Structures are given as C-alpha cells and as structure tokens.
Amino acid sequence: ASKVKQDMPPVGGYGPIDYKRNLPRRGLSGYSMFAVGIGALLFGYW
Amino acid sequence: ASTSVKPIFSRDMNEAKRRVRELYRAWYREVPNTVHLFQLDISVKQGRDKVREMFKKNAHITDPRVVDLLVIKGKMELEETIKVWKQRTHVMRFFHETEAPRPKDFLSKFYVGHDP
C-alpha cells in the first residue's frame, strides 16, 4: 500500500517570513552633526 | 413610421449637398499644402483630380443619412492630412503605384485566370 504523495508544507508549517519595512536608524543628531562641522572649520582657520 | 428615422446632421438631401460642397472646398485648398509638406512626387493637378475622382464615386447616393456619414469620414480623413497624422505612405495609398494594371475585358480575364 502506497500513500498519496504530492507537494505539501512540512509538518508544523514553514518558519515565519518577514514582510514589514525595516529601514533602520543611523547617525548622530542634528546638534552633534553641526558641532562636528563647525569644529572642523575652527581648526582649519587656526 | 417605418420610414421615419432620426437624422445625423441633415434633414434632407438639399442640406446634405451643402455639407458635401464645403468638404470639397476644404480638400481642394489643402492639396497644395499636402503636396508640399509630404514632399510628394505627384503634381498639384494630379492631387486635385484624385479628390475629384473620390467624390465622383459616391455621386449616386440619394439617402441623406448615408451622405452624412460619407462627409463625416471625409472630415476625419481630412483632419489626418492637415495635422500630419498620416505619413507619405498613407497619402500615396490613394494612387496604387505598385499594383500592375488589371484587365477589364472578357478575353484578357479569360487568359489569366478564373475570376469573372
């Protein structure tokens, strides 16, 4: 006796699948970005 | 009631002929501009005779509704030439320059094939 065999998902189902937007956060704040930029100018002028 | 029908533009042949003539004047005055914009190899006289031939074919119509349609198609065919939506190939299709003459007499048709 041979059982039926056709394409089926594995017992318990497949693992979870990510679908949501995941644009991460990087970099410093505006205050610190401006502080580093002005600091570079002051050293350059000196 | 059977012969009572809705008109398209003209209620009788007398008004229809007015539209036919206005259309003919439009085509007559456009040939020189057409023969120039498309750089055709025909002359203006040849162009204006083709318009005459096309109008002559439908000279036996006595239905005002039919005449209205022929004018509607003529005005459509005219708007394509003025605005250069056609191309030199489309304009020259009225002349059949690449089709060999086909005989009109019985004997010649007999020699070549079976068509009447």
Partner: protein, 154 residues
C-alpha cells in the same frame, strides 16, 4: 493544468524568506531620496471624484483615498481566507501611488506565507470530464476517458 512538482513550495519559501530585504534596499534608494521625491510629489494629482468618473481602478483610486479593492469587496477563489491590508494614499500623487505599490509588494509576501502553510491536498482540476480533460493514464485504459479526451481537444 498540472499539480505542483515536489519541492517547489520549499523553493518558494526560501525565496520569500529573503524578499522583504530586497524591498528595503529598494526603499533605501528612492523613498527618502530628495531627488526622487521632487520628481514624484504633487505630480499628477487626481481628486477622488475625478478618478471614479474617469474610469480609474486599482492604485489610481487607492492613491486618492478611495477604500476599494476587489480582493476584499468582491472576493474570488480563496481571497476571503487570507489576511492582508490595503494601502491607502492621502495626496493622490505619484509619490503616494509609489508607496502603495511598494507596500502592496509587502502584503503579497504576507499572503504567500499563508498559501504555503494552508495549501490543502486533493486534485488540481474539476473532477468533471466534460470540462477538464482526464488523466493520461485513464485516457489510455477507459473508453469514456478516451472519448472525452478526443472531443475536448477537437
């Protein structure tokens, strides 16, 4: 026409597992790029009333705030057994419509993840041999199945 070959659903799962990352990389190039926004924001604005009267459908409606999607309002097949969200725009311009299609790609990955897990067993065409052709094995042994194969294909 045919049933899925063995092993295809596993390969669909491996593809779907990584696709959401591909969309994110696409959004790192377009969504916040100021040059992209300038080309698509407040360009081609459609009012919710002009869209209906001009015959629009799909994201041309959903971009202008009209809440309409045939998959949810007039469902067909088994679209009423899956969960997804319909993106909706607010300004009805090119940028909002670009966000609706990017977000609809994510909701498709959500539907696909449910089709792979809720795929039932059975046959793959209606078991009425006056519409769908019989199996080739039974078309070569049974007289009715040969008659119905002959007539359906001629």
């Amino acid at each position: 026409h045919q049933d899925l070959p063995l092993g295809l659903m596993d390969d669909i799962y491996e593809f779907s597992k990584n696709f959401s990352l591909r969309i994110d990389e696409l959004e790192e190039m377009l969504t916040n790029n100021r040059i992209w926004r300038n080309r698509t924001v407040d360009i081609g604005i459609v009012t919710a009333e002009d869209a209906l009267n001009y015959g629009f459908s799909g994201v041309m409606l959903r971009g202008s705030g009209i809440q309409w999607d045939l998959r949810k309002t007039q469902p067909y097949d088994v679209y009423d057994q899956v969960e997804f969200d319909v993106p909706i725009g607010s300004r009805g311009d090119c940028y909002d419509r670009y966000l609706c299609r990017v977000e609809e790609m994510r909701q498709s990955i959500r539907i696909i993840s449910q089709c792979l897990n809720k795929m039932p067993p059975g046959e793959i065409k209606v078991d009425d041999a006056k519409v769908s052709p019989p199996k080739r094995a039974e078309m070569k042994t049974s007289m009715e199945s040969l008659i119905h194969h002959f007539k359906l294909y001629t």
